[PDB]
């Protein structure tokens with residue numbers, strides 16, 4: 507998009523992704539940066555972060 | 566409105582991503598929004614230079630620019646402006662956030678606002694404080 511819109515959905519996704527406990531800081535920041543660069547992809551990015559979070563569950 | 570937990574730390578800061586166009590803001594604390602009067606939505610994806618204005622010293626701004634190009638920390642004092650145009654002095658500290666290998670990933674920038682330019686002991690105290698704040702933000706982000 508020539509003009510990124512930071513709608514309620516994207517802003518909520520920032521919080522939810524950041525709060526995932528099993529991501530490392532680099533991954534959290536990378537997802538937040540990706541949301542910033544393409545906020546239309548919030549649902550997809552949130553889904554991917556949640557998948558990674560479950561995969562990285564501590565054992 | 567919706568701040569990440571990192572952005573709820575009660576200090577003025579932003580974090581930028583130098584691999585996005587124009588090294589733009591990707592995190593901004595609630596305190597920073599209150600100080601500057603901007604919303605988070607109107608500054609995400611934007612470079613922090615909008616805080617400057619006509620009275621800002623350009624030599625000081627070039628010092629910041631040179632440090633960013635070096636990928637290093639810097640500390641300066643410069644005039645900044647709220648969204649409505651109100652001046653404040655900003656004792657400003659930048660420092661890179663690195664990975665374990667030492668490569669720069671992001672920049673943290675911390676602002677200590679005042680009505681007056683600070684010097685001597687007050688300046689030393691302020692410089693110590695903003696450096697500690699930046700270190701604490703880095704630690705909070707990286708903590709396990």
Ligand SMILES: Cc1cc2nc3c(=O)[nH]c(=O)nc-3n(C[C@H](O)[C@H](O)[C@H](O)COP(=O)(O)O)c2cc1C
Pocket residue numbers: 579580581588612613614616617626627629630633643645655657659672673674675676
């Ligand atoms: C993390 C970070 C925070 C910054 N915070 C401020 C700030 O509080 N006030 C300001 O005047 N400039 C701040 N800057 C500097 C501007 O973003 C920019 O680097 C500076 O104006 C030099 O670049 P330019 O000549 O392209 O504007 C910050 C930069 C970074 C990377």
Ligand SMILES: [Cl-]
Pocket residue numbers: 587588612633
């Ligand atoms: Cl920059």
Ligand SMILES: [Cu+2]
Pocket residue numbers: 642682683684
């Ligand atoms: Cu001085």
